[PDB]
Design a binder for this molecule. Structure first.
Ligand SMILES: Nc1ncnc2c1ncn2[C@@H]1O[C@H](COP(=O)(O)OP(=O)(O)O[C@H]2O[C@H](CO)[C@@H](O)[C@H](O)[C@H]2O)[C@@H](O)[C@H]1O
Ligand SMILES: Nc1ncnc2c1ncn2[C@@H]1O[C@H](COP(=O)(O)OP(=O)(O)O[C@H]2O[C@H](CO)[C@@H](O)[C@H](O)[C@H]2O)[C@@H](O)[C@H]1O
Ligand SMILES: Nc1ncnc2c1ncn2[C@@H]1O[C@H](COP(=O)(O)OP(=O)(O)O[C@H]2O[C@H](CO)[C@@H](O)[C@H](O)[C@H]2O)[C@@H](O)[C@H]1O
Ligand SMILES: Nc1ncnc2c1ncn2[C@@H]1O[C@H](COP(=O)(O)OP(=O)(O)O[C@H]2O[C@H](CO)[C@@H](O)[C@H](O)[C@H]2O)[C@@H](O)[C@H]1O
Lengths: 463, 463, 463, 463
């Protein structure tokens, strides 16, 4: 019946493609828990039409979920990325409502639930991850009412006015309510969920504000209670802090500045390419600052590192076209031959190279239109043990709830985005250090370990 | 100092362009109150660069507000229609954030406040109308703290996640909080407003659900309390009921059906042209039903009457192009020469002609994506004293909160929109009558008089 | 070796899909020649992956060419319709240059040549039809130097400045030069071909103007001479004339006018849907005339009958969208419920119904941007034995070279298109008759029989 | 009556904006003729609403033509740049036919003719320049039949099938026929003009091919004959040759290569931004070569220098957007931070800097879709006295008729454009020198002086 007493369910297995374990991430965050539990991980291995035979990793048992390329297209590229993703992110792009996508999403979700049941021992603890798998908790509780089930959403949970658009709004809500604990990064998501529970499902809920890792909400579902909480994700702050101190990284950061023609100021953007990330906004702000002579085109350069994402989704292709136009435009207007003012890469950057960029950057531009947390904001902070740099951060990130000492911006307020970029570029050394010290105190004290433990303690208490 | 003890403030004066009073509307709803008060109306006369000399109407004193064509472009076509309107309607279209529009909106709002102060006697009651004038209550209270000020929003008040986009979010919120009473059509708007008050402004508010014309919310603003309520607007039900019974109207309805080639079923759409109104959705549903042979192209016709709106706003021009494409397409595919399946007019229809269409229509299609109330739903119901017809109504209207006996649809769920249109077309006489009787009981009992009195009683109680 | 002494090669067999002979067309025009020759027809049967076994029709032997759906996509929808077609029609739409399309076009052309060789007896006469098969004459002469080969292009032959764009310009030119006779509708095409022969291929040609069915051009290709001529295609004028006189047709024409609400004037457009046909132009002209009050929206109606074409080619889908927008727009602006000013059908009209429309129409609108001949202009004329009606005809048709008594227009000169439509609508009975009599004298004397005989006499003389 | 016996008429005066004479160009080419004649120049000074008082330059008398910003918009940006320009260049972009533009073009042309008459002495020689002023010769001959009038078109003269689109085709043709000599860069243009003369105007013309600076064509216009010829424009080859040899230029070329990260190969594009210039084609070719690994992204760089043009014309803005997208795209895909594979400037480059780029570039990419001559091809050749470099040149330039030793390409044949770019990048030193020597022999022997003298000798012989 499966001999795992702790099970993680996520769209992907924690491996890279023969194959090896992916570095960092949740799987590393859960390392010391797997040392005391019989742990399993359920997910798609990332290859189409694979076996579903369990793979032993010593520390982990991997249960591959079989998906065809067609399953992936309709469940993932379709329903997950082109229905749920834009809807949950404040419909920045118009969601597509497609019944064939929904039906595949249901099937695939069931397949994940079945795989989980195979792995899970009696009374096992299950942690379901993220928006692609919102039906699993209910499906799992129906197959296996003995299980303790947690669910955490890594993206925002939208306001009810928007969520209601979903023709399958009730099925998704019922899906989440199959969990013992439903967690979000922010109290706002939790409160939206409680309100949805009363409005759409008619369940009795708690009415108080939801705290951070405390003051939990409750939804009554017949005989049982669903716990609702906010657990803001973070990074392995100490590890990144240590990694950024390496001599090789610091020398690379110096070499990067030399390769850029030794600018006095470097702005940096690091993003998975997504319309949620507000890359177009920072480029527009930068172009207008150059037009206004408020940024010196001779000693200031912007580096944007976009890692490719969701190429088969038309909205992402269109966003890529817009950004790339902006890059060519800005350089043609304000650059010189042999000296761009914008450097842009559309590719995955090796982790040590990326860290060197964090170390090199005088201003980190993290300006999403809407983002669940955004780890890049926290990664930059963790890397600046030298206390240099400046973080310009959108209010519409979960990170802005913790990183209040950054230069916060409303990305829709372009005038203030521009004022703020100038302010960050021209800050005094002391003021820069004051902010970075405060940000680091936060990020170092609130790491992924605290997050993981807080969620699992909450989940454990529902027993 | 002005000798009016009751003052209405709205973007437009209640006149038609020399000039005469506009029929119906709020000005008719307030007729018996003006018989017992010295009443004034403040608004733009609809002509550019006019005098601001008061005009006596016997029952009313009209205070024209001077606006230039440029004022109208930036305050109205700009900020009101291309910033606030799309934002408040769940960003169906992308709002434009423009500082020049904001500054004009502020100036014009101040000009309205000044005009109000001129007209208003000491201790006068003021009722400010709608989204173009959200700054007036605060501006007015600053000029004239002796006044009792009510404000009613005729469009939805969006969720906080969306409202927060507005770079001038705080100024707008402070603006509304200048009122003694802030009213919305729905509890949902009221509750969004209270939540915004706590989150953005930090004011202490009530935490309970907001009732309908009862169980009011409260926002504490220093020394004074702001009342927050839901007052769902309606029509002069009895008057429209009476008007629809005229012999001439009923004969016209018969003649309309003959001019349409005597179809067995007529579907009707009546809308101010707006992307909020979901005209594209009903056309898509109709086209697919015809493709699927689920509607008989030989005996069923759809009439769409769009009255022109906001021609200088690009989004409205684009929507008009899309709808008109759909019309040509559907007729080219399923019509015959001499017999369209879709009749479409882009023009204002005389009121008696419009009522004849309500009487003629077997199915009323009211399918907005998002609408504050939508009066057309209620007008149709009021017209069907014969108890014929069927109302297909979007859940995303304020009207759907009262007209639950209609055929309710999620307009994003196209499959169900299509199922519902077939069901309404093919309903039994008895089932049709059962629904229409129940709808009429509601609409006849809850008219614009009840709405107006409920709001003003609430406003009066803040003294 | 095949026992046919006269062979027609065309993209399609002359059949309809079991199957029966297509009415009218070239196959009917060649009926009395097949009575004195052993005739064969080579072409695709219109079904994918068919046999290539000959089919005896008594009067004809049909040699089916096997094509896969992929062959059709790349050779026909691709190279023929999306490379050659827009290029030859003055690049109204941007040609797509695709090497995979070219290679398939070559393969398919070879397959046609092989099929021809199978059917053709020693010394047989072969008539290759149109732009999809321009490589066949050279390929055929290489396989079978005993054959007499004619080729006729049914579309315009573009000026050299445009033809030169084609990366495979030389291969196409060499292809055509494989024929003993290369014929075009117009001297202009013939002269373009001669000039191309000198410029691109370097062959010695004649330098005189090319006559109509006379004064032929010559291209010297080593040992042999290629004849170049103009043979303007026509219709079976006498048959259509006779058909239009039927009592049933005339009664249908009257019934059509009654079904249109008995307009005083009917304008008609009849076209295979194509961006070459200038349907968008006549709609624009009509809309502006209505806007200007120069056409009476109360007693004048426009009927447009578009038969579907090339749905898998994006440019045709886009044109359909534009036209259909125009239709919806014009009706929404100038129509009434129950009375459109534009009736539009996107569907094949039965031949007797179409003829009834020709008979009913007061003004025939034939306004292509560029058209090889356009048979509709001549069909209308043939149908008006009552001498009623008016033909408005684009100068950029081959038909305008013969139908000079029509109301000729430059479709790019919209002001004059509009003036001309008013003039045609309001012509005196006598002036209308004078033009229609002259047009009919032309069309009745120059029919498809004269065309076919003239081409084949020219082809025969090369022996 | 004006005391100038030689008069140049062009859209612009030969000055830069107080003001000074523009370097190089036609005005320098005509320097030794002005030393023996009383010369005048008629044109717009480039400022709106100026005086028309003559300005003495000692060597020249400048007659400013008064134009308002509105005149410029409708005559120049409108008719010239958005009607004639796309039409004459094979409708790469769709011409706009606008009667208001035409009427302004007529008025402005008349104003130029009047200014000319003011300056011109009895029996004076007049040289009218280019496509904005095609009506002047007829207008001038009507005012002043004593004048000898030449006209030269600097852009291609399109084939008749395209020219015929122009609603004002006859007025333009009559306009040109007002000249004693009409000259084009190429025999092809001359021959198109003769054919147009016979077809549209019905004039008797010569029928032979038109030679280069010889074997002239003739159009008979009543009593007088119009000479038609081909005079391919060139540059001051010797001066540019000398200029490129300067030590400072050669050092700058070396410094440019160092600033580019010392690539082994530099490709260069230099163009006035125009959709005729095929900048999008070379970028596409370069991107695909990089994708295919046929160009080394580590040691090969492309520099594109676009100088801004016609910003108020939407087609030019759209082309700029497309190019700039391509630049950003290619760099994001194949560049490195600190090392773009494409450098792009949208700005006027100082002449000495531009020459340094010619000297630095290993491959010159001159790939227009259609261009009258293209001087950049010849400028590059003149600069390479070191015999290094390679010229990749579109067949669809007038320059390709003289520069046959370059690497000629059909820009529509992208496969061959790509093959050719690889071939040019990888040519042997010797083969490179062989081509460059031959090209230089041509360009050095056929300079702007030969062109100017040949045209004026032809013009003089019509006396
Ligand atoms: N060019 C590049 N090269 C190499 N690495 C790059 C890169 N660009 C970004 N990365 C890395 O990818 C990760 C992106 O982190 P995000 O917070 O943006 O996660 P994401 O949006 O994908 O997932 C969701 O989950 C996370 C965690 O819950 C939330 O922060 C987020 O809001 C939510 O959308 C970072 O670790 C970052 O360093
Ligand atoms: N073709 C036509 N010819 C003639 N008359 C036509 C017409 N089409 C529509 N009308 C009339 O115009 C009015 C439209 O009523 P709506 O409820 O849609 O108001 P509207 O959206 O403009 O204003 C806002 O205020 C009202 C009242 O608060 C809210 O119902 C609404 O949600 C909100 O957007 C109806 O009275 C209707 O009969
Ligand atoms: N809605 C409808 N319903 C039923 N029938 C319809 C119809 N619309 C058009 N037709 C019929 O289809 C034919 C179209 O004739 P065209 O001259 O336009 O041919 P087409 O352009 O396809 O072919 C090419 O070959 C012919 C003949 O050489 C050239 O005239 C032409 O220029 C060239 O492009 C007519 O017989 C017409 O009556
Ligand atoms: N980025 C940059 N910075 C500085 N200078 C730059 C530049 N880009 C281009 N130039 C210069 O501008 C000129 C462009 O020459 P073209 O031949 O392309 O002329 P153009 O097309 O404008 O005019 C028309 O006239 C000429 C002459 O008859 C014809 O060659 C042409 O076909 C026709 O369209 C060159 O002298 C070139 O060196």
């Amino acid at each position: 019946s499966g001999d795992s007493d702790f099970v993680v369910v996520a769209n992907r297995l924690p491996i890279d493609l023969s194959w090896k374990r992916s570095p960092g991430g949740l799987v590393t965050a859960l390392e010391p828990l797997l040392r005391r539990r019989r742990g399993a991980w359920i997910g798609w291995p990332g290859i189409p039409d694979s076996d579903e035979d369990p793979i032993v990793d010593g520390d982990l048992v991997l249960y591959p979920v079989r998906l065809s390329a067609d399953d992936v297209a309709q469940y993932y590229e379709g329903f997950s990325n082109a229905t749920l993703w834009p809807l949950y992110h404040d419909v920045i792009v118009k969601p597509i409502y497609n019944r064939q996508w929904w039906e595949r999403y249901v099937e695939v979700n069931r397949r994940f639930a079945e795989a989980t049941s195979r792995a899970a021992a009696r009374g096992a603890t299950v942690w379901v991850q993220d928006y692609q798998l919102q039906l699993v908790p209910k499906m799992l509780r129906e197959l296996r009412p003995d299980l303790t089930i947690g669910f955490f959403l890594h993206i925002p949970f939208p306001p009810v006015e928007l969520f209601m658009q979903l023709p399958w709004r009730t099925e998704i809500t019922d899906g989440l309510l199959g969990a013992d604990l439903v967690g979000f990064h922010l109290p706002g998501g939790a409160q939206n969920f409680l309100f949805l529970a009363r409005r759409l499902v008619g369940a009795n809920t708690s009415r108080a504000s939801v705290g951070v890792r405390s003051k939990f909400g409750e939804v009554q579902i017949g005989s049982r209670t669903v716990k609702v909480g906010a657990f803001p994700i973070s990074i392995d702050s100490a590890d990144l802090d240590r990694q950024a101190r390496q001599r090789s990284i610091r020398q690379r950061a110096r070499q990067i500045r030399a390769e850029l023609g030794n600018p006095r100021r470097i702005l940096l953007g690091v993003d998975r390419l997504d319309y949620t990330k507000g890359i177009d906004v920072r480029l527009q702000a930068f172009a207008e600052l150059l037009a206004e002579g408020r940024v010196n085109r001779e000693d200031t350069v912007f580096v944007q590192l976009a890692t490719p994402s969701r190429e088969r989704v038309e909205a992402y292709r269109l966003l890529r076209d817009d950004i790339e136009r902006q890059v060519g435009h800005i350089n043609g207007e304000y650059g010189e031959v042999g000296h761009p003012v914008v450097h842009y890469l559309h590719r995955p950057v090796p982790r040590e190279e990326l860290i060197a960029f964090f170390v090199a950057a005088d201003v980190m531009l993290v300006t999403p239109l809407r983002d669940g947390m955004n780890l890049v904001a926290k990664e930059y902070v963790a890397c600046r043990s030298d206390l240099g740099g400046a973080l310009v951060l959108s209010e519409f990130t979960g990170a802005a709830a913790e990183l209040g000492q950054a230069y916060l911006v409303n990305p829709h307020n372009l005038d203030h985005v521009k004022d703020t970029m100038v302010a960050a570029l021209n800050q005094t050394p002391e003021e820069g250090r004051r902010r970075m010290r405060a940000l680091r105190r936060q990020v170092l004290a609130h790491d992924v370990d605290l997050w993981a433990r807080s969620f699992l303690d909450a989940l454990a208490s529902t027993r």
